Design a protein around this ligand. Sequence first.
Ligand SMILES: *[C@@H]1O[C@H](CO)[C@@H](O)[C@H](O)[C@H]1NC(C)=O
Ligand SMILES: *[C@@H]1O[C@H](CO)[C@@H](O)[C@H](O)[C@H]1NC(C)=O
Lengths: 49, 50
Amino acid sequence: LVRDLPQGFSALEPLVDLPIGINITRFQTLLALHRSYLTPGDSSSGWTA
Amino acid sequence: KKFLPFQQFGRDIADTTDAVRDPQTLEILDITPCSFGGVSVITPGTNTSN
Ligand SMILES: *[C@@H]1O[C@H](CO)[C@@H](O)[C@H](O)[C@H]1NC(C)=O
Ligand SMILES: *[C@@H]1O[C@H](CO)[C@@H](O)[C@H](O)[C@H]1NC(C)=O
């Protein structure tokens, strides 16, 4: 029942260290398309707006 | 003590490592300094006795 970031403290344990050795300046987020790009529904085709 | 999967060493209040994880086995064991203390010597007086 909290829309935004909750109030509290949770520590982030390390997950992984990649020796990628590359240069990073920008990033993007990958999303899952449940609806159809060919035929967009009027509503409810996606996930609750 | 329980070590998180990324954790290897342990510490207390100084640089010396209190606990440690073996490389060969995941088990962790703590370290304590080899015994030390001041040897104070008592005597009743060399005049009185040896
Ligand atoms: C990374 O690329 C930027 C250009 O987008 C450049 O200015 C920067 O020097 C590069 N850094 C490294 C470590 O290659
Ligand atoms: C030890 O002390 C006594 C006095 O208490 C003295 O008479 C005696 O000569 C002393 N002995 C030595 C070896 O110093």
